[model samples]
Target: SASDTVFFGIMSGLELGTFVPGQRLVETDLVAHFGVGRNSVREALQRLAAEGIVDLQRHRGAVIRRLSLQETLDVLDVAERMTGLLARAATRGSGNQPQVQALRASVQALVAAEKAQDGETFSNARRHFYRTLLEMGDNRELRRLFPTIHMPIVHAQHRLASLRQMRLDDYRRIATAVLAGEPDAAEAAGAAHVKNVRGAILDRQ
Candidate 1:
Protein backbone atom coordinates (compact mmCIF):
# COMPACT_ATOMS: atom_id res chain seq x y z
CA SER A 1 0.00 0.00 0.00
CA ALA A 2 2.92 2.34 0.71
CA SER A 3 4.32 1.67 -2.73
CA ASP A 4 0.91 2.21 -4.29
CA THR A 5 0.49 5.52 -2.52
CA VAL A 6 3.97 6.61 -3.54
CA PHE A 7 3.37 5.56 -7.12
CA PHE A 8 0.10 7.48 -7.22
CA GLY A 9 1.71 10.55 -5.65
CA ILE A 10 4.25 10.60 -8.45
CA MET A 11 1.51 10.14 -10.99
CA SER A 12 -0.64 12.89 -9.43
CA GLY A 13 2.28 15.28 -9.74
CA LEU A 14 2.56 14.41 -13.39
CA GLU A 15 -1.19 15.00 -13.83
CA LEU A 16 -1.30 18.30 -11.94
CA GLY A 17 1.74 19.81 -13.61
CA THR A 18 3.66 19.68 -10.35
CA PHE A 19 6.57 18.03 -12.13
CA VAL A 20 7.75 17.57 -15.70
CA PRO A 21 10.68 15.89 -17.34
CA GLY A 22 14.06 17.59 -16.78
CA GLN A 23 12.79 19.27 -13.61
CA ARG A 24 14.70 18.24 -10.52
CA LEU A 25 12.68 16.87 -7.59
CA VAL A 26 14.16 17.90 -4.30
CA GLU A 27 13.68 15.53 -1.35
CA THR A 28 12.21 18.16 0.90
CA ASP A 29 9.64 19.14 -1.71
CA LEU A 30 8.40 15.58 -2.04
CA VAL A 31 8.36 14.79 1.67
CA ALA A 32 6.54 18.02 2.50
CA HIS A 33 3.98 17.61 -0.26
CA PHE A 34 3.48 13.88 -0.08
CA GLY A 35 3.95 13.42 3.67
CA VAL A 36 6.15 10.45 2.96
CA GLY A 37 9.48 9.54 4.58
CA ARG A 38 12.74 9.89 2.67
CA ASN A 39 13.14 6.12 2.45
CA SER A 40 9.74 5.63 0.95
CA VAL A 41 10.25 8.50 -1.45
CA ARG A 42 13.57 7.16 -2.52
CA GLU A 43 12.10 3.71 -3.03
CA ALA A 44 9.26 5.12 -5.07
CA LEU A 45 11.56 7.28 -7.15
CA GLN A 46 13.82 4.35 -7.86
CA ARG A 47 10.89 2.22 -8.93
CA LEU A 48 9.58 4.98 -11.23
CA ALA A 49 13.03 5.53 -12.69
CA ALA A 50 13.20 1.84 -13.47
CA GLU A 51 9.84 2.16 -15.19
CA GLY A 52 11.15 5.06 -17.36
CA ILE A 53 9.01 7.64 -15.60
CA VAL A 54 11.87 9.25 -13.73
CA ASP A 55 15.52 9.94 -14.47
CA LEU A 56 18.03 9.47 -11.65
CA GLN A 57 20.88 11.82 -12.37
CA ARG A 58 24.38 11.06 -11.15
CA HIS A 59 24.55 13.44 -8.15
CA ARG A 60 21.61 15.62 -9.07
CA GLY A 61 18.83 13.53 -7.64
CA ALA A 62 15.81 12.73 -9.88
CA VAL A 63 13.82 14.40 -12.61
CA ILE A 64 10.74 13.37 -14.51
CA ARG A 65 11.55 11.67 -17.79
CA ARG A 66 11.03 14.07 -20.69
CA LEU A 67 9.38 12.39 -23.62
CA SER A 68 10.46 13.78 -26.95
CA LEU A 69 8.05 14.48 -29.81
CA GLN A 70 9.08 11.34 -31.62
CA GLU A 71 8.77 9.35 -28.42
CA THR A 72 5.24 10.71 -27.88
CA LEU A 73 4.26 9.75 -31.40
CA ASP A 74 5.68 6.28 -30.91
CA VAL A 75 3.71 5.90 -27.69
CA LEU A 76 0.50 6.96 -29.44
CA ASP A 77 1.11 4.45 -32.22
CA VAL A 78 1.57 1.65 -29.72
CA ALA A 79 -1.51 2.75 -27.79
CA GLU A 80 -3.64 2.76 -30.90
CA ARG A 81 -2.50 -0.74 -31.80
CA MET A 82 -3.07 -2.09 -28.31
CA THR A 83 -6.43 -0.36 -28.00
CA GLY A 84 -7.58 -1.91 -31.25
CA LEU A 85 -6.58 -5.33 -29.98
CA LEU A 86 -8.42 -4.68 -26.72
CA ALA A 87 -11.58 -3.70 -28.57
CA ARG A 88 -11.46 -6.89 -30.57
CA ALA A 89 -10.89 -8.96 -27.48
CA ALA A 90 -13.69 -7.19 -25.66
CA THR A 91 -16.09 -7.94 -28.47
CA ARG A 92 -15.06 -11.56 -28.44
CA GLY A 93 -15.54 -11.95 -24.70
CA SER A 94 -18.98 -10.25 -24.77
CA GLY A 95 -19.94 -11.31 -21.28
CA ASN A 96 -20.19 -9.48 -17.95
CA GLN A 97 -23.54 -7.74 -18.23
CA PRO A 98 -22.61 -5.33 -15.49
CA GLN A 99 -19.55 -4.10 -17.36
CA VAL A 100 -21.61 -3.30 -20.41
CA GLN A 101 -24.03 -1.30 -18.29
CA ALA A 102 -21.13 0.50 -16.62
CA LEU A 103 -19.69 1.45 -20.00
CA ARG A 104 -22.99 2.92 -21.13
CA ALA A 105 -23.26 4.90 -17.91
CA SER A 106 -19.72 6.16 -18.36
CA VAL A 107 -20.54 7.39 -21.83
CA GLN A 108 -23.57 9.28 -20.55
CA ALA A 109 -21.46 10.85 -17.83
CA LEU A 110 -18.90 11.98 -20.37
CA VAL A 111 -21.59 13.59 -22.47
CA ALA A 112 -22.89 15.51 -19.48
CA ALA A 113 -19.39 16.53 -18.45
CA GLU A 114 -18.70 17.88 -21.89
CA LYS A 115 -21.92 19.85 -21.94
CA ALA A 116 -21.17 21.36 -18.57
CA GLN A 117 -17.63 22.32 -19.56
CA ASP A 118 -16.30 20.54 -16.52
CA GLY A 119 -12.68 19.77 -17.27
CA GLU A 120 -12.12 17.63 -14.21
CA THR A 121 -15.32 15.70 -14.79
CA PHE A 122 -14.46 15.26 -18.44
CA SER A 123 -11.03 13.93 -17.56
CA ASN A 124 -12.38 11.50 -15.00
CA ALA A 125 -15.06 10.33 -17.38
CA ARG A 126 -12.46 9.77 -20.08
CA ARG A 127 -10.44 7.65 -17.67
CA HIS A 128 -13.55 5.61 -16.82
CA PHE A 129 -14.16 5.11 -20.50
CA TYR A 130 -10.76 3.53 -21.09
CA ARG A 131 -10.82 1.63 -17.82
CA THR A 132 -14.08 0.02 -18.88
CA LEU A 133 -12.52 -0.93 -22.19
CA LEU A 134 -9.49 -2.47 -20.50
CA GLU A 135 -11.67 -4.39 -18.08
CA MET A 136 -13.89 -5.66 -20.86
CA GLY A 137 -10.82 -6.75 -22.77
CA ASP A 138 -9.85 -8.82 -19.72
CA ASN A 139 -6.21 -9.01 -20.71
CA ARG A 140 -4.00 -8.48 -17.67
CA GLU A 141 -0.87 -7.92 -19.72
CA LEU A 142 -2.47 -5.25 -21.85
CA ARG A 143 -3.96 -3.58 -18.79
CA ARG A 144 -0.50 -3.43 -17.24
CA LEU A 145 0.86 -1.65 -20.30
CA PHE A 146 -1.81 1.09 -20.00
CA PRO A 147 -0.13 3.16 -17.26
CA THR A 148 2.86 3.92 -19.49
CA ILE A 149 0.71 5.35 -22.27
CA HIS A 150 -2.17 6.60 -20.17
CA MET A 151 -0.17 9.17 -18.18
CA PRO A 152 1.32 10.85 -21.22
CA ILE A 153 -2.04 10.80 -22.94
CA VAL A 154 -3.62 12.41 -19.90
CA HIS A 155 -0.92 15.05 -19.83
CA ALA A 156 -1.59 15.83 -23.46
CA GLN A 157 -5.32 16.00 -22.83
CA HIS A 158 -4.87 18.39 -19.91
CA ARG A 159 -3.08 20.75 -22.23
CA LEU A 160 -5.51 20.20 -25.07
CA ALA A 161 -8.60 20.56 -22.92
CA SER A 162 -7.58 24.15 -22.26
CA LEU A 163 -8.40 24.96 -25.87
CA ARG A 164 -12.07 24.18 -25.19
CA GLN A 165 -12.47 22.90 -28.71
CA MET A 166 -12.55 19.13 -28.26
CA ARG A 167 -15.73 18.16 -30.06
CA LEU A 168 -18.04 15.94 -28.04
CA ASP A 169 -19.39 14.42 -31.24
CA ASP A 170 -16.29 12.29 -31.68
CA TYR A 171 -16.60 10.86 -28.20
CA ARG A 172 -20.27 10.01 -28.77
CA ARG A 173 -19.35 8.25 -32.00
CA ILE A 174 -16.76 6.09 -30.30
CA ALA A 175 -19.05 5.26 -27.39
CA THR A 176 -21.87 4.32 -29.72
CA ALA A 177 -19.59 2.08 -31.75
CA VAL A 178 -18.31 0.27 -28.66
CA LEU A 179 -21.82 -0.22 -27.23
CA ALA A 180 -23.09 -1.68 -30.45
CA GLY A 181 -20.40 -4.38 -30.20
CA GLU A 182 -18.98 -3.24 -33.51
CA PRO A 183 -15.36 -4.07 -32.83
CA ASP A 184 -14.07 -2.84 -36.16
CA ALA A 185 -15.97 0.41 -35.83
CA ALA A 186 -14.84 0.73 -32.25
CA GLU A 187 -11.19 0.33 -33.25
CA ALA A 188 -11.52 2.80 -36.10
CA ALA A 189 -13.27 5.36 -33.92
CA GLY A 190 -10.73 4.98 -31.11
CA ALA A 191 -7.81 5.37 -33.50
CA ALA A 192 -9.42 8.38 -35.12
CA HIS A 193 -9.85 10.07 -31.74
CA VAL A 194 -6.19 9.45 -30.87
CA LYS A 195 -5.07 10.65 -34.30
CA ASN A 196 -7.00 13.86 -33.83
CA VAL A 197 -5.17 14.48 -30.58
CA ARG A 198 -1.88 13.63 -32.23
CA GLY A 199 -2.61 16.25 -34.84
CA ALA A 200 -3.21 18.76 -32.08
CA ILE A 201 0.11 17.89 -30.45
CA LEU A 202 1.94 18.23 -33.76
CA ASP A 203 0.27 21.59 -34.34
CA ARG A 204 2.02 22.89 -31.25
CA GLN A 205 5.35 22.18 -32.91
Candidate 2:
Protein backbone atom coordinates (compact mmCIF):
# COMPACT_ATOMS: atom_id res chain seq x y z
CA SER A 1 0.00 0.00 0.00
CA ALA A 2 2.76 2.41 0.92
CA SER A 3 4.68 1.51 -2.20
CA ASP A 4 1.78 2.03 -4.57
CA THR A 5 0.75 5.25 -2.89
CA VAL A 6 4.26 6.67 -2.70
CA PHE A 7 4.85 6.11 -6.39
CA PHE A 8 2.15 8.60 -7.28
CA GLY A 9 2.25 10.59 -4.09
CA ILE A 10 5.84 11.63 -4.68
CA MET A 11 4.99 12.74 -8.17
CA SER A 12 2.11 14.88 -6.90
CA GLY A 13 4.35 16.31 -4.20
CA LEU A 14 6.88 17.37 -6.82
CA GLU A 15 4.22 18.83 -9.09
CA LEU A 16 2.78 20.87 -6.25
CA GLY A 17 6.18 22.12 -5.07
CA THR A 18 5.97 20.26 -1.84
CA PHE A 19 9.30 18.99 -3.16
CA VAL A 20 11.29 21.76 -4.77
CA PRO A 21 13.30 21.40 -7.93
CA GLY A 22 16.98 20.44 -7.60
CA GLN A 23 16.04 18.68 -4.41
CA ARG A 24 17.67 15.31 -4.18
CA LEU A 25 15.33 12.37 -3.71
CA VAL A 26 16.78 9.22 -2.38
CA GLU A 27 15.40 5.87 -1.27
CA THR A 28 16.46 6.44 2.29
CA ASP A 29 14.91 9.91 2.26
CA LEU A 30 11.56 8.53 1.13
CA VAL A 31 11.74 5.72 3.60
CA ALA A 32 12.47 8.04 6.47
CA HIS A 33 10.20 10.90 5.50
CA PHE A 34 7.26 9.14 3.92
CA GLY A 35 7.63 5.76 5.57
CA VAL A 36 7.87 4.29 2.11
CA GLY A 37 9.92 1.25 1.14
CA ARG A 38 12.96 1.50 -1.10
CA ASN A 39 11.11 -0.37 -3.83
CA SER A 40 8.40 2.26 -3.81
CA VAL A 41 10.98 5.03 -3.99
CA ARG A 42 12.69 3.32 -6.91
CA GLU A 43 9.45 2.92 -8.80
CA ALA A 44 8.50 6.51 -8.14
CA LEU A 45 11.85 7.81 -9.29
CA GLN A 46 11.71 5.76 -12.47
CA ARG A 47 8.25 7.07 -13.31
CA LEU A 48 9.15 10.65 -12.52
CA ALA A 49 12.28 10.42 -14.62
CA ALA A 50 10.23 9.22 -17.53
CA GLU A 51 7.92 12.19 -17.09
CA GLY A 52 10.90 14.59 -17.29
CA ILE A 53 10.39 15.62 -13.73
CA VAL A 54 13.41 13.80 -12.33
CA ASP A 55 16.91 13.32 -13.61
CA LEU A 56 18.17 9.80 -13.02
CA GLN A 57 21.77 9.21 -13.82
CA ARG A 58 23.92 6.08 -13.82
CA HIS A 59 25.95 7.33 -10.92
CA ARG A 60 23.86 10.26 -9.73
CA GLY A 61 20.76 8.59 -8.36
CA ALA A 62 17.80 11.04 -8.65
CA VAL A 63 17.56 14.81 -8.73
CA ILE A 64 14.73 17.13 -9.69
CA ARG A 65 14.94 18.49 -13.18
CA ARG A 66 15.53 22.21 -13.37
CA LEU A 67 14.02 24.29 -16.15
CA SER A 68 16.40 26.47 -18.09
CA LEU A 69 15.40 29.98 -19.18
CA GLN A 70 14.98 28.86 -22.79
CA GLU A 71 13.05 25.77 -21.78
CA THR A 72 10.68 27.94 -19.81
CA LEU A 73 10.14 30.26 -22.77
CA ASP A 74 9.62 27.36 -25.11
CA VAL A 75 7.07 25.83 -22.80
CA LEU A 76 5.21 29.11 -22.54
CA ASP A 77 5.25 29.55 -26.31
CA VAL A 78 3.68 26.15 -26.83
CA ALA A 79 1.10 26.86 -24.16
CA GLU A 80 0.19 30.20 -25.73
CA ARG A 81 -0.28 28.78 -29.20
CA MET A 82 -2.27 25.73 -28.14
CA THR A 83 -4.31 27.66 -25.59
CA GLY A 84 -5.08 30.37 -28.16
CA LEU A 85 -6.37 27.79 -30.59
CA LEU A 86 -8.37 26.18 -27.81
CA ALA A 87 -9.86 29.53 -26.83
CA ARG A 88 -11.02 30.18 -30.39
CA ALA A 89 -12.53 26.74 -30.65
CA ALA A 90 -14.25 27.18 -27.32
CA THR A 91 -15.78 30.51 -28.27
CA ARG A 92 -16.99 29.07 -31.56
CA GLY A 93 -18.47 25.98 -29.95
CA SER A 94 -20.07 27.19 -26.73
CA GLY A 95 -21.51 30.58 -27.66
CA ASN A 96 -20.03 31.81 -24.39
CA GLN A 97 -22.96 30.73 -22.21
CA PRO A 98 -21.85 27.94 -19.87
CA GLN A 99 -18.13 28.29 -20.49
CA VAL A 100 -18.24 32.00 -19.85
CA GLN A 101 -20.22 31.40 -16.70
CA ALA A 102 -17.69 28.89 -15.52
CA LEU A 103 -14.88 31.25 -16.33
CA ARG A 104 -16.60 33.97 -14.34
CA ALA A 105 -16.95 31.66 -11.39
CA SER A 106 -13.29 30.72 -11.58
CA VAL A 107 -12.29 34.35 -11.65
CA GLN A 108 -14.45 35.04 -8.65
CA ALA A 109 -12.79 32.20 -6.83
CA LEU A 110 -9.39 33.60 -7.72
CA VAL A 111 -10.41 36.98 -6.39
CA ALA A 112 -11.52 35.52 -3.12
CA ALA A 113 -8.32 33.50 -2.83
CA GLU A 114 -6.27 36.59 -3.62
CA LYS A 115 -8.01 38.63 -0.96
CA ALA A 116 -7.18 35.92 1.49
CA GLN A 117 -3.58 35.71 0.17
CA ASP A 118 -3.91 31.97 -0.38
CA GLY A 119 -1.52 31.22 -3.21
CA GLU A 120 -2.53 27.57 -3.53
CA THR A 121 -6.23 28.37 -3.89
CA PHE A 122 -5.50 31.12 -6.40
CA SER A 123 -3.41 28.76 -8.52
CA ASN A 124 -6.03 26.01 -8.35
CA ALA A 125 -8.73 28.44 -9.49
CA ARG A 126 -6.53 29.66 -12.32
CA ARG A 127 -5.99 26.04 -13.37
CA HIS A 128 -9.76 25.42 -13.31
CA PHE A 129 -10.24 28.44 -15.57
CA TYR A 130 -7.99 26.93 -18.24
CA ARG A 131 -9.46 23.47 -17.75
CA THR A 132 -12.89 24.94 -18.51
CA LEU A 133 -11.53 26.43 -21.69
CA LEU A 134 -10.04 23.08 -22.68
CA GLU A 135 -13.34 21.29 -22.12
CA MET A 136 -15.24 23.92 -24.06
CA GLY A 137 -12.80 23.66 -26.97
CA ASP A 138 -13.78 20.02 -27.40
CA ASN A 139 -10.68 19.29 -29.47
CA ARG A 140 -9.21 15.94 -28.61
CA GLU A 141 -5.92 16.73 -30.31
CA LEU A 142 -5.53 20.01 -28.48
CA ARG A 143 -6.39 18.34 -25.20
CA ARG A 144 -3.71 15.73 -25.83
CA LEU A 145 -1.12 18.40 -26.48
CA PHE A 146 -1.91 20.28 -23.27
CA PRO A 147 0.06 18.10 -20.84
CA THR A 148 3.29 18.33 -22.79
CA ILE A 149 2.94 22.10 -23.05
CA HIS A 150 1.80 22.57 -19.49
CA MET A 151 4.17 20.30 -17.51
CA PRO A 152 7.28 22.43 -17.62
CA ILE A 153 5.37 25.62 -16.96
CA VAL A 154 3.47 23.92 -14.20
CA HIS A 155 6.79 23.13 -12.57
CA ALA A 156 7.96 26.66 -13.16
CA GLN A 157 4.76 28.00 -11.68
CA HIS A 158 5.26 25.91 -8.60
CA ARG A 159 8.84 27.10 -8.32
CA LEU A 160 7.84 30.72 -8.69
CA ALA A 161 4.50 30.83 -6.99
CA SER A 162 5.18 34.26 -5.56
CA LEU A 163 5.83 35.68 -9.02
CA ARG A 164 2.66 34.08 -10.36
CA GLN A 165 0.64 35.46 -7.49
CA MET A 166 1.62 38.98 -8.50
CA ARG A 167 0.00 38.48 -11.88
CA LEU A 168 -3.42 37.30 -10.79
CA ASP A 169 -4.91 40.43 -12.33
CA ASP A 170 -3.41 39.58 -15.69
CA TYR A 171 -5.03 36.14 -15.58
CA ARG A 172 -8.33 37.78 -14.59
CA ARG A 173 -8.16 39.95 -17.66
CA ILE A 174 -7.64 36.91 -19.89
CA ALA A 175 -10.62 35.19 -18.30
CA THR A 176 -12.72 38.33 -18.86
CA ALA A 177 -11.84 38.44 -22.54
CA VAL A 178 -12.59 34.74 -23.02
CA LEU A 179 -15.89 35.11 -21.18
CA ALA A 180 -16.86 37.96 -23.46
CA GLY A 181 -16.60 35.58 -26.43
CA GLU A 182 -14.36 37.90 -28.33
CA PRO A 183 -12.24 35.36 -30.13
CA ASP A 184 -9.63 37.84 -31.21
CA ALA A 185 -9.59 39.37 -27.78
CA ALA A 186 -9.42 35.96 -26.19
CA GLU A 187 -6.44 34.92 -28.30
CA ALA A 188 -4.68 38.20 -27.65
CA ALA A 189 -5.37 37.92 -23.96
CA GLY A 190 -4.10 34.35 -23.81
CA ALA A 191 -0.91 35.24 -25.68
CA ALA A 192 -0.39 38.31 -23.55
CA HIS A 193 -0.83 36.38 -20.36
CA VAL A 194 1.77 33.82 -21.41
CA LYS A 195 4.13 36.56 -22.47
CA ASN A 196 3.60 38.25 -19.15
CA VAL A 197 4.42 35.04 -17.32
CA ARG A 198 7.46 34.51 -19.51
CA GLY A 199 8.64 37.97 -18.60
CA ALA A 200 8.20 37.20 -14.94
CA ILE A 201 10.26 34.02 -15.19
CA LEU A 202 12.95 35.79 -17.17
CA ASP A 203 13.00 38.64 -14.66
CA ARG A 204 13.90 36.25 -11.88
CA GLN A 205 16.86 34.87 -13.79
Candidate 3:
Protein backbone atom coordinates (compact mmCIF):
# COMPACT_ATOMS: atom_id res chain seq x y z
CA SER A 1 0.00 0.00 0.00
CA ALA A 2 2.79 2.39 0.83
CA SER A 3 4.59 1.48 -2.38
CA ASP A 4 1.46 2.05 -4.40
CA THR A 5 1.22 5.48 -2.89
CA VAL A 6 4.76 6.22 -3.95
CA PHE A 7 4.07 4.92 -7.44
CA PHE A 8 0.99 7.10 -7.82
CA GLY A 9 2.80 10.05 -6.26
CA ILE A 10 5.54 9.83 -8.91
CA MET A 11 2.88 9.40 -11.59
CA SER A 12 1.01 12.52 -10.46
CA GLY A 13 4.33 14.29 -10.41
CA LEU A 14 4.79 13.28 -14.03
CA GLU A 15 1.26 14.47 -14.86
CA LEU A 16 1.83 17.80 -13.11
CA GLY A 17 5.13 18.29 -14.97
CA THR A 18 7.01 18.06 -11.71
CA PHE A 19 8.80 15.08 -13.25
CA VAL A 20 9.88 15.28 -16.85
CA PRO A 21 11.04 12.55 -19.19
CA GLY A 22 14.75 11.72 -19.12
CA GLN A 23 15.06 13.27 -15.67
CA ARG A 24 16.93 11.21 -13.14
CA LEU A 25 14.85 9.95 -10.24
CA VAL A 26 17.16 9.72 -7.32
CA GLU A 27 15.88 7.23 -4.79
CA THR A 28 16.87 9.51 -1.93
CA ASP A 29 14.97 12.40 -3.46
CA LEU A 30 11.93 10.21 -4.03
CA VAL A 31 12.08 8.92 -0.49
CA ALA A 32 12.26 12.46 0.82
CA HIS A 33 9.59 13.82 -1.51
CA PHE A 34 7.09 11.03 -0.89
CA GLY A 35 7.94 10.83 2.79
CA VAL A 36 8.09 7.10 2.41
CA GLY A 37 10.62 4.44 3.33
CA ARG A 38 13.53 3.82 1.01
CA ASN A 39 12.16 0.33 0.44
CA SER A 40 8.88 1.83 -0.74
CA VAL A 41 10.71 4.12 -3.11
CA ARG A 42 12.73 1.21 -4.44
CA GLU A 43 9.67 -0.92 -5.01
CA ALA A 44 7.90 1.98 -6.69
CA LEU A 45 10.79 2.53 -9.05
CA GLN A 46 10.89 -1.17 -9.88
CA ARG A 47 7.18 -1.15 -10.62
CA LEU A 48 7.58 1.95 -12.76
CA ALA A 49 10.39 0.23 -14.67
CA ALA A 50 8.24 -2.87 -15.15
CA GLU A 51 5.49 -0.66 -16.55
CA GLY A 52 7.93 1.01 -18.96
CA ILE A 53 7.50 4.37 -17.29
CA VAL A 54 11.07 4.53 -16.09
CA ASP A 55 14.31 2.92 -17.13
CA LEU A 56 16.78 1.65 -14.58
CA GLN A 57 20.17 2.65 -15.80
CA ARG A 58 23.24 0.87 -14.51
CA HIS A 59 25.15 4.10 -13.96
CA ARG A 60 22.30 6.61 -13.58
CA GLY A 61 19.89 4.67 -11.41
CA ALA A 62 16.28 5.38 -12.58
CA VAL A 63 15.45 7.86 -15.30
CA ILE A 64 12.22 8.62 -17.06
CA ARG A 65 12.59 7.40 -20.60
CA ARG A 66 11.71 9.45 -23.68
CA LEU A 67 9.97 7.82 -26.59
CA SER A 68 11.40 7.96 -30.07
CA LEU A 69 9.25 9.07 -33.00
CA GLN A 70 8.62 5.44 -33.91
CA GLU A 71 7.95 4.50 -30.30
CA THR A 72 5.61 7.48 -30.00
CA LEU A 73 3.55 6.22 -32.93
CA ASP A 74 3.48 2.78 -31.37
CA VAL A 75 2.35 4.15 -28.05
CA LEU A 76 -0.31 6.26 -29.79
CA ASP A 77 -1.65 3.19 -31.54
CA VAL A 78 -2.02 1.44 -28.20
CA ALA A 79 -3.52 4.54 -26.58
CA GLU A 80 -5.99 4.93 -29.43
CA ARG A 81 -7.21 1.39 -29.03
CA MET A 82 -7.57 1.64 -25.24
CA THR A 83 -9.24 5.08 -25.43
CA GLY A 84 -11.73 3.83 -28.02
CA LEU A 85 -12.54 0.86 -25.84
CA LEU A 86 -13.00 3.12 -22.82
CA ALA A 87 -15.39 5.41 -24.70
CA ARG A 88 -17.36 2.53 -26.14
CA ALA A 89 -17.70 0.86 -22.77
CA ALA A 90 -18.58 4.07 -20.93
CA THR A 91 -21.59 4.76 -23.15
CA ARG A 92 -23.29 1.58 -21.98
CA GLY A 93 -23.35 2.76 -18.38
CA SER A 94 -23.65 6.50 -18.76
CA GLY A 95 -26.56 6.82 -16.35
CA ASN A 96 -24.50 7.66 -13.25
CA GLN A 97 -25.22 11.31 -12.57
CA PRO A 98 -22.44 11.72 -10.02
CA GLN A 99 -19.73 10.47 -12.33
CA VAL A 100 -21.20 12.57 -15.12
CA GLN A 101 -20.87 15.60 -12.90
CA ALA A 102 -17.28 14.64 -12.15
CA LEU A 103 -16.54 14.41 -15.85
CA ARG A 104 -18.18 17.77 -16.40
CA ALA A 105 -16.12 19.28 -13.62
CA SER A 106 -12.97 17.89 -15.20
CA VAL A 107 -13.81 19.63 -18.45
CA GLN A 108 -14.56 22.87 -16.67
CA ALA A 109 -11.24 22.61 -14.89
CA LEU A 110 -9.50 22.14 -18.22
CA VAL A 111 -11.23 25.24 -19.57
CA ALA A 112 -10.26 27.27 -16.53
CA ALA A 113 -6.68 26.03 -16.72
CA GLU A 114 -6.45 27.16 -20.32
CA LYS A 115 -7.93 30.55 -19.51
CA ALA A 116 -5.38 30.98 -16.75
CA GLN A 117 -2.56 29.72 -18.99
CA ASP A 118 -1.68 27.05 -16.45
CA GLY A 119 -0.19 24.09 -18.25
CA GLU A 120 0.30 21.96 -15.15
CA THR A 121 -3.31 22.42 -14.11
CA PHE A 122 -4.46 21.55 -17.60
CA SER A 123 -2.40 18.36 -17.49
CA ASN A 124 -3.77 17.32 -14.11
CA ALA A 125 -7.33 18.08 -15.21
CA ARG A 126 -6.84 16.09 -18.37
CA ARG A 127 -5.72 13.11 -16.25
CA HIS A 128 -8.83 13.43 -14.07
CA PHE A 129 -10.98 13.56 -17.19
CA TYR A 130 -9.51 10.26 -18.36
CA ARG A 131 -9.88 8.73 -14.92
CA THR A 132 -13.57 9.56 -14.91
CA LEU A 133 -13.96 8.01 -18.32
CA LEU A 134 -12.11 4.90 -17.11
CA GLU A 135 -14.36 4.61 -14.06
CA MET A 136 -17.41 4.92 -16.26
CA GLY A 137 -16.06 2.19 -18.47
CA ASP A 138 -15.98 -0.09 -15.42
CA ASN A 139 -13.43 -2.45 -16.88
CA ARG A 140 -10.84 -3.89 -14.55
CA GLU A 141 -8.49 -4.75 -17.37
CA LEU A 142 -8.66 -1.29 -18.86
CA ARG A 143 -8.16 0.22 -15.45
CA ARG A 144 -5.13 -1.94 -14.86
CA LEU A 145 -3.54 -1.20 -18.22
CA PHE A 146 -4.37 2.37 -19.18
CA PRO A 147 -1.95 4.05 -16.79
CA THR A 148 0.95 2.07 -18.16
CA ILE A 149 0.74 3.80 -21.48
CA HIS A 150 3.43 6.35 -22.38
CA MET A 151 1.08 9.22 -23.21
CA PRO A 152 2.28 11.40 -20.36
CA ILE A 153 5.86 10.93 -21.46
CA VAL A 154 4.88 11.94 -24.96
CA HIS A 155 3.12 15.02 -23.63
CA ALA A 156 6.08 15.99 -21.49
CA GLN A 157 8.45 15.61 -24.41
CA HIS A 158 6.30 17.50 -26.89
CA ARG A 159 5.12 20.53 -24.87
CA LEU A 160 2.72 21.90 -27.46
CA ALA A 161 -0.05 24.42 -26.71
CA SER A 162 -1.80 23.44 -29.92
CA LEU A 163 -1.92 19.85 -28.66
CA ARG A 164 -3.64 21.02 -25.50
CA GLN A 165 -6.33 22.95 -27.39
CA MET A 166 -6.90 20.05 -29.80
CA ARG A 167 -7.26 17.71 -26.84
CA LEU A 168 -9.82 20.00 -25.19
CA ASP A 169 -11.93 20.17 -28.36
CA ASP A 170 -11.71 16.41 -28.81
CA TYR A 171 -12.64 15.79 -25.18
CA ARG A 172 -15.73 17.95 -25.65
CA ARG A 173 -16.71 15.87 -28.66
CA ILE A 174 -16.15 12.67 -26.66
CA ALA A 175 -18.18 13.95 -23.71
CA THR A 176 -21.03 14.82 -26.06
CA ALA A 177 -21.08 11.33 -27.52
CA VAL A 178 -20.80 9.56 -24.16
CA LEU A 179 -23.51 11.72 -22.61
CA ALA A 180 -25.79 10.94 -25.53
CA GLY A 181 -25.08 7.19 -25.07
CA GLU A 182 -23.86 6.94 -28.62
CA PRO A 183 -21.36 4.11 -28.45
CA ASP A 184 -20.11 4.29 -32.02
CA ALA A 185 -19.70 8.05 -31.97
CA ALA A 186 -18.06 7.95 -28.57
CA GLU A 187 -15.56 5.31 -29.66
CA ALA A 188 -14.84 7.18 -32.87
CA ALA A 189 -14.35 10.41 -31.03
CA GLY A 190 -12.05 8.82 -28.50
CA ALA A 191 -9.95 7.12 -31.12
CA ALA A 192 -9.79 10.28 -33.15
CA HIS A 193 -8.63 12.23 -30.15
CA VAL A 194 -5.45 10.14 -30.02
CA LYS A 195 -5.30 10.07 -33.79
CA ASN A 196 -5.27 13.85 -33.92
CA VAL A 197 -2.45 13.93 -31.41
CA ARG A 198 -0.50 11.47 -33.51
CA GLY A 199 -1.08 13.63 -36.54
CA ALA A 200 -0.01 16.73 -34.68
CA ILE A 201 3.21 15.06 -33.58
CA LEU A 202 3.94 13.91 -37.09
CA ASP A 203 3.12 17.33 -38.50
CA ARG A 204 5.58 18.89 -36.15
CA GLN A 205 8.31 16.65 -37.50
Taking all chains together, each candidate's TM-score versus the true structure is 0.81, 0.74, 0.92
Model 3 lDDT, residue 172, Cα: 88
Candidate 2 worst ten-residue window by lDDT: 149-158
lDDT of 2 by residue, 128-158 (tens): 8778878877789977665554454355444
Clashes of each: 0, 0, 0
List candidate 1 segments past 4 Å from native.
Answer: 58-60, 92-95, 153-158, 163-168
Q: Sorted by lDDT, highest first, which candidate order results?
A: 3, 1, 2
State the lDDT at 11 in candidate 3: 76
Model 1 vs truth, CA RMSD: 2.9
Q: lDDT per residue, candidate 3, 1-205, as tens digits?
A: 8899878877777666788888988878887788888888888889988877899876436999888989988888998988888888888667999998998898899889888888878877888888888889899998889785437677777765547777888888888888888899899988988899888888878
Instruction: Quickly count the clashes in candidate 2.
Output: 0
Question: lDDT for each of the candidates?
Answer: 0.69, 0.69, 0.82
Pull out the clashing pairs in model 1: none
Q: Which of candidates 2 and 3 reaches a greater TM-score?
A: 3
Task: Tell me the TM-score of model 1.
Answer: 0.81
